[PDB]
Design an enzyme around this catalytic site. Structure first.
Site, short mmCIF file in Angstrom:
data_model
loop_
_atom_site.label_atom_id
_atom_site.label_comp_id
_atom_site.label_asym_id
_atom_site.label_seq_id
_atom_site.Cartn_x
_atom_site.Cartn_y
_atom_site.Cartn_z
CG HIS C 17 9.62 -6.36 5.44
ND1 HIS C 17 10.15 -7.05 4.38
CD2 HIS C 17 8.60 -5.63 4.95
CE1 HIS C 17 9.49 -6.74 3.28
NE2 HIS C 17 8.54 -5.87 3.60
CE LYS C 41 1.03 -8.16 -3.44
NE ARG C 90 8.88 1.19 0.36
CZ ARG C 90 8.51 -0.07 0.15
NH1 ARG C 90 9.10 -1.03 0.84
NH2 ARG C 90 7.57 -0.39 -0.74
CB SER C 128 10.17 -7.65 -1.24
OG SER C 128 10.24 -7.94 0.15
K LIG Z 1 8.45 -0.43 5.29
K LIG Z 2 5.69 -7.13 1.80
#
Ligand SMILES: [K+]
Ligand SMILES: [K+]
Ligand SMILES: COc1nnc(-c2ccc(Cl)cc2)c(C)c1C
Ligand SMILES: COc1nnc(-c2ccc(Cl)cc2)c(C)c1C
Ligand SMILES: COc1nnc(-c2ccc(Cl)cc2)c(C)c1C
Ligand SMILES: [K+]
Ligand SMILES: [K+]
Ligand SMILES: [K+]
Ligand SMILES: [K+]
Lengths: 157, 157, 158, 158, 157, 158
Positions: C17, C41, C90, C128
């Site tokens: 990030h 989440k 990604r 994450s």
């Molecule tokens: K990313």
């Molecule tokens: K995120």
């Protein structure tokens, strides 16, 4: 409804995967046109038509025909309302989406339907079969017997 | 910041998808160079430049230029710091990742940015449009009017 | 003044990030790092914790503003006067979800233009979720997180 | 009489689902829209609610029959005398799961032939989950749902 | 077990990605045959063999050999039971699945194993490297020094 | 002695897993089938149950050792003196996650080399999750599971 479906391709040569797909199509629709594209090339168009006719002779509602126009143009002229596509893997799927949205633009009354081959044929293609056979690999398992015989003759000369 | 961005491609021919992407780019960056690659081929480089200039004439901060060097080499010379790429489907994404990591190695001060076309153009390409038009399909909906006229003339002779 | 928003759950914010937001600040005059509450989440860190971690981790970037939100992202973007929506790309798998979100966001706010940036190869295989999974089993994740975030992750799991 | 089944969770039914079932009715004589109870998915609407919403949203299609089921889908298909199994193909990511389901269903009922239809470009980037997510944050989803479904979604979230 | 593995490819030219993969293979298997395909072409087969031998000279259990048969036919003759494949991205994966199921049909006693290169080389290919170098881009970082020198010489004439 | 580890949740172990571990034993001298506790996945079978099922299902393979673990996988691999990490590659979608895991594991233990094996076409479209889903609805999954596992799955769901 008495549906007319078209199953187009180059079928160079027709494989057991194609036989699988067209067999499924004939169990679903009243008439299936196995449409062999004149362009793009191991077997000539006349060779590819004859091999496909022999390999589908047992299917009573299959008609093997050659065509040279844009597929959608031939489908329109044949009064087909169903377009059979065989779905093997993810890699083909993106092109299949492209092609089907284009075909829907060209002929909205032609509905693309995607059929799934058996696991047995989910990892082969005419291109891979030809490449293996050209380089002395065994492809007997992937082809109808008449196609196997014609392929051996073709590769001998 | 007064950013200079480059939008490279072969644009053979430029489609409504390209117009969509470059329009979005011009709303984001102060100056957009629509860079037409000299190599790889229905229209000549001079034909492709003229069609793209006419099709983007209404966009005041677009500059259409031809180039023959490695894209990164031309971007460096043009003092571009943003590299516009259009993102259609998953299939292009893997090559786009390859290309962007290579371009970052060649010119780290050039940042690749990926823009998304409208749903209308998310399933077309110059290649598919040419193939359909060459085989007598209707592609009017996918091209600027000037490109449509030039394409018909090209396919007639 | 071009204003861009970089929304996400950032639970917690990773070096991936930081890579993306740094690239964004080199391109746009002002970048809002917008942290979604994302209750569905079940985030490991509260929104307040995630904002504080991101503020510390981006303090060195002068044109980053870290804000939390529970609104519809598109409404929050309009209310921040953003015209650019930053997302990091990604892998092949999220690309598809990113397109769904971007086409939806374009329906909600057509003048907010989604742009996708590509992280460095160093961070192209982390997330994450993956960092949290390694840390839950006490594996070393110092390399993937800002120092303040690593400390906070160690403390939270202790 | 060719009979096709279009199974799914339909929580709630979207314009994308209406697109697919409409295409199915132009191809097959009778289409059963079969709503799976899907308790593992914790659906927002009860099975009864989802059946009622789909019945209303497909009333204009004369050869659609909406039924709920908690059986094994393949057993329900056999018991409906279906020989065609309709699934909509939206993105690359679900294609893989769709093949798993179809190969499993072919093992359970080889005479039920799976067929995949492609929705219009208009609905190629939405899903029940995405519409619900936007609506949870009060974003406008009128464009993606039949009128009766939109009302019900607004009411449920109110 | 004393496993014999084959790592086939065209290696045109061999890149640091190939060196990465074969190095990993040599840490896993007792003997690794780096098999260079005679067909498909910047460097000749003799050039590609020499460059690969020099670039792998430090690996004591690597044998560089050229071959012209179907890969599976050569693997069978070499008594290999492991087939090394390098896995970069999703796009290659579908073809790799096709190829491995075909290779398992041709030679079931040859087990395909997929190795993962370092992140450093996960976005390059011989094709991309050649294309960049042919168009005046810097590819020094992606090649062994001997390959870099041979590539410059090749592109000069 | 080359030692390989084949880690996974194995909830329960399927014929696809048996395929992969069999291939592994033909390649490496000793294979540790390592069952992760995976509490975050809420497994249907306890770790003890999954170890017992895998031990029975692999008893015919003389160089397989079944062990359970709750450690970081990479630490468990180092502590088992493994230098090869076996993962099965089924579909395009997990390939991406497998690369994330493998690059993370390489950061945690660079001398543990990840290797991916491809199952037979027979098992290329199944998963523990899919078999469980069919069995929850009483569909016949005898073809996809070892006999002892099928019995245990029937008993657990009864
Ligand atoms: K990313
Ligand atoms: K995120
Ligand atoms: C809509 O896309 C297409 N549809 N059909 C065809 C086509 C097929 C067979 C023959 Cl003989 C001629 C043309 C092509 C080349 C394209 C791109
Ligand atoms: C970094 O990858 C690349 N970048 N640019 C180009 C390129 C584009 C246009 C022109 Cl005219 C010449 C070269 C190519 C062929 C590659 C592989
Ligand atoms: C099983 O698929 C294949 N296996 N091997 C080869 C092959 C490789 C190198 C050489 Cl020199 C000759 C042939 C090919 C062309 C295919 C399709
Ligand atoms: K659904
Ligand atoms: K759909
Ligand atoms: K598992
Ligand atoms: K597997």
């Amino acid at each position: 409804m008495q549906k007319r479906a078209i199953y187009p391709g180059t079928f160079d040569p027709i494989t057991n995967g194609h036989i699988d797909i067209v067999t499924r199509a004939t169990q679903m629709f009243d008439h299936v046109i196995l449409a062999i594209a004149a362009s793009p090339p191991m077997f000539t168009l006349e060779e590819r038509v004859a091999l496909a006719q022999q390999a589908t002779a047992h299917l009573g509602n299959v008609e093997v025909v050659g065509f040279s126009d844009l597929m959608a143009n031939f489908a329109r002229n044949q009064h087909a309302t169903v377009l059979i596509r065989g779905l093997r893997a993810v890699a083909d799927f993106e092109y299949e989406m492209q092609l089907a949205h284009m075909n829907r633009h060209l002929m909205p009354e032609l509905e693309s339907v995607f059929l799934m081959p058996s696991k047995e044929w989910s990892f082969i293609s005419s291109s891979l079969v030809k490449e293996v056979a050209r380089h002395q690999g065994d492809v007997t398992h992937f082809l109808p017997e008449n196609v196997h015989q014609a392929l051996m003759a073709k590769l001998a000369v």
